Design a protein around this ligand. Structure first.
Ligand SMILES: CN1c2c(nc(N)[nH]c2=O)NC[C@@H]1CNc1ccc(C(=O)N[C@@H](CCC(=O)O)C(=O)O)cc1
Ligand SMILES: CN1c2c(nc(N)[nH]c2=O)NC[C@@H]1CNc1ccc(C(=O)N[C@@H](CCC(=O)O)C(=O)O)cc1
Ligand SMILES: CN1c2c(nc(N)[nH]c2=O)NC[C@@H]1CNc1ccc(C(=O)N[C@@H](CCC(=O)O)C(=O)O)cc1
Ligand SMILES: CN1c2c(nc(N)[nH]c2=O)NC[C@@H]1CNc1ccc(C(=O)N[C@@H](CCC(=O)O)C(=O)O)cc1
Lengths: 286, 285
C-alpha cells in the first residue's frame, strides 16, 4: 500500500509518527509504553508508522524498537537515521538488504559527526538501491534563500522518493515551498514526489521545549498564550488542521501529491490522545 | 486541430502529413496548380497538422508557402527552419508571435549564419509560446548510443516534441525509444511525443533526394530497385510494419507516439501511395 503510493507518486499517503522511549527505563516500562503505542495506533487507518531517531535523551534504536517491540503492528515502519551517529561500517551493515522484506527509511543529516549525509546517500546507492528512501524538508528554511525546493531536488537526485517535513506551523512558508517546487519541476520537465506534511500537536511547555530542541518553532502568539497559562493543545490541533486543509487545496489545484504524517512527541496522555484523534480526523479529510 | 492539445497533453496519436514546398523557379500559376493538387489530396485526410519542410535546389519559404497558398487547408502547419540560412535578426522577425494564433516550428541545425543553440535562445526571448520541436535521428543512436541524450537536451532548450527523419530500421528506433524511456524513468523526467516519419520510396529519383536529406533505405530494398523492380509497395509495407512494431512497443511502456507521413516525390504514383499510407496509419491508430 505505502510502497505503491510512493512508487506511483500518489496523493493520500498518511502516516503516524512516534519517538521510541529512553534506554534508561526498566525493561518493564518499555513493554508497557510499547503496548500502549500498539493499542492506540492499531486503532488507526494509516499507511505506515514513522519511527524517529535523535542525535539527556538517548532513545531505543528505531529499528530495534520496531523489530523487538512493535511487531504486533502490521504496517510498514519508516525508520529514521541520524546518519552522523553511525560509523560508516555500522551504516553499511544497517543498510544491507534483508531477504524477503521491504525497507523504508529517512536519512537525516546534521542539525548544526562520524558520517556525513552525502556519504550516507552513496553508501545506500552501493548496498541497497531498493531501500525506499525519503528526505527531511524544512519549509521554514525556504524563507531564508528560496532554495529548499532546490535542496529537495538534489535529494531526489541522490535517491529520495518522498519527503517528510518537520512539523508545519506556518502555511505561507509551506505554500511558498510547494510553489517553488511545483514551478521548478514544471519548468525542468520533472515528475513530482509525495510531499508528506507532518502535524504535531503541542499542549504543554514540556512538549514545546522538546519541539524547540528538534528545531520546531510554534507561532509567537501561540507560545504567548502558553506562557500566560492557557491550554493551547486544542488550538494546536485546530491550527494544524487549518494549515493542512489549505495545503491540500493548494495541492489539488496543481496536482502536487501530498501526504500527512501525524507526529506524537509528548509523554502526556492527553496530548497523545490528541495526536491519535488528529490522525483519525486527517484520514476523514483526505 | 487537436494538435496543440495533444502536444501539451503529451498524448499519443499525433498524426501529420509532410510536404516540401515546390521549387522557387516555377511560375505563380504553376505554384498555384501544385498548391491546388496539395490542398485537393490533403483535405481528404484526417490529420492533426501539415508539416512543411525547409531545405538548407531552392524551394519556397515554408511559412510563406503555408500562409499565401495553403489558407484553404483548415489545419495547423508545422514550419521547419534550417536555422543556419537565417541571420540572427531575420530569425527574431520570423519568430515573433502573431496575435490570436498558435505557431508550430521545428528548428533544424547543420548537417551557417545562426547556431542552433542561439536559435533556441532567440525563441526563449522572442516567443516562449512557440510550440517547438526537434529532429531526432534514430540511425545515429547506433554510433554512440546518445541520441536519447541529444533529445533530452533539446527538451531542456524548449522542445516539446520530436519528429524523426524517415524510419527504415525498427531496431535503431526501438533502441532509441528504449534508452529514452529508461533514462526518463531514472532521472524523473516526463516524456514528450516522438513522432516517427514514414516516407515511401518509389524510384531512384526519390531515393537520391532522400539520400541528399541524409536518409537511407535498407540495402536489400535498394538492391531490388537497382535491379529494376518496383519497390514502392514494399517501402510502404515495410514502413507500416515498422510503425506497428513501434506503436506496440510504445503502448506497452506508455511512450507517447505519433506519426508523420512524408511525401517527398514529384511522381503522382508515389504521392498517391503517401496519401493512402496517411489514411492507413490513421485507421491503425
Ligand atoms: C526531523 N527530526 C525530527 C526527529 N525526531 C522527531 N521526533 N521529530 C523531528 O522533527 N529526529 C530527526 C530530526 C531532528 N532535527 C533535525 C532538524 C533539522 C535537521 C537538518 O537540518 N537536516 C538536514 C541536514 C543538512 C546537512 O547536513 O546536509 C537534512 O536534509 O537532513 C536535522 C535534524
Ligand atoms: C523519549 N521520549 C520523550 C519525549 N518527550 C519527553 N519529555 N521525554 C521523553 O522521554 N518525546 C519522545 C519520547 C516519548 N516517550 C514516551 C515515554 C513514555 C510514555 C508513556 O508512559 N505513555 C503513557 C503515559 C500517560 C501520561 O503520563 O499521561 C500513556 O498512557 O501513553 C510516552 C512517551
Ligand atoms: C530533417 N530534414 C528534412 C528536410 N526536408 C525533408 N523533406 N525531409 C527531411 O527529412 N529538411 C531538413 C532536414 C534535412 N536533413 C538534415 C538531416 C540531419 C540534420 C541534423 O543532423 N540536424 C541536427 C543538427 C546538429 C548540428 O547542428 O550540429 C539537429 O539537431 O537539428 C539536419 C538536416
Ligand atoms: C522541391 N521538391 C522537389 C522534390 N523532388 C524533386 N526531384 N524535385 C523537386 O523540385 N521533392 C520535394 C518538392 C516537391 N515538389 C513538387 C513539385 C510539383 C509537383 C506536381 O506538379 N505534382 C503533380 C504531378 C504528378 C506527376 O508528375 O505525375 C500532381 O499530380 O500532384 C509535386 C511536387
Amino acid at each position: 500500500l505505502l510502497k505503491q503510493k510512493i512508487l506511483n507518486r500518489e496523493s493520500g499517503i498518511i502516516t503516524y509518527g512516534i519517538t521510541p522511549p529512553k534506554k534508561n527505563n526498566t525493561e518493564e516500562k518499555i513493554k508497557e509504553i510499547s503496548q500502549k503505542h500498539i493499542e492506540r495506533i492499531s486503532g488507526l487507518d494509516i499507511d505506515g508508522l514513522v519511527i524517529y531517531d535523535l542525535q539527556f535523551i538517548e532513545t531505543i534504536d528505531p529499528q530495534i524498537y520496531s523489530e523487538n517491540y512493535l511487531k504486533d503492528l502490521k504496517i510498514p515502519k519508516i525508520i529514521y537515521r541520524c546518519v552522523g551517529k553511525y560509523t560508516p561500517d555500522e551504516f553499511r551493515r544497517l543498510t544491507r538488504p534483508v531477504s524477503g522484506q521491504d525497507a523504508f527509511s529517512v536519512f537525516v543529516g546534521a542539525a548544526s559527526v562520524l558520517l556525513k549525509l552525502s556519504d550516507a546517500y552513496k553508501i545506500r546507492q552501493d548496498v541497497n538501491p531498493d531501500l525506499l528512501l525519503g528526505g527531511v524538508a524544512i519549509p521554514e528554511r525556504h524563507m531564508k534563500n528560496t532554495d529548499e525546493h532546490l535542496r529537495i531536488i538534489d535529494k531526489i537526485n541522490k535517491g529520495c522518493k518522498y519527503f517528510i517535513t518537520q512539523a508545519v506551523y506556518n502555511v505561507e512558508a509551506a505554500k511558498d515551498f510547494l510553489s517553488d517546487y511545483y514551478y521548478y519541476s514544471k519548468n525542468n520537465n520533472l515528475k513530482m514526489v509525495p510531499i508528506i506534511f507532518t502535524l504535531t500537536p503541542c499542549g504543554s511547555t514540556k512538549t514545546l521545549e522538546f519541539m524547540k530542541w528538534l528545531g520546531i518553532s510554534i507561532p509567537r502568539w501561540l507560545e504567548n498564550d502558553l506562557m500566560n497559562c492557557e491550554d493551547i493543545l486544542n488550538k494546536s490541533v485546530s491550527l494544524s488542521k487549518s494549515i493542512f486543509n489549505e495545503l491540500m487545496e493548494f495541492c489539488l489545484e496543481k496536482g502536487i501529491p501530498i501526504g500527512c504524517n501525524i507526529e506524537s512527541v509528548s509523554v502526556r496522555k492527553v496530548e497523545i490522545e490528541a495526536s491519535i484523534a488528529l490522525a483519525k480526523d486527517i484520514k476523514y479529510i483526505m
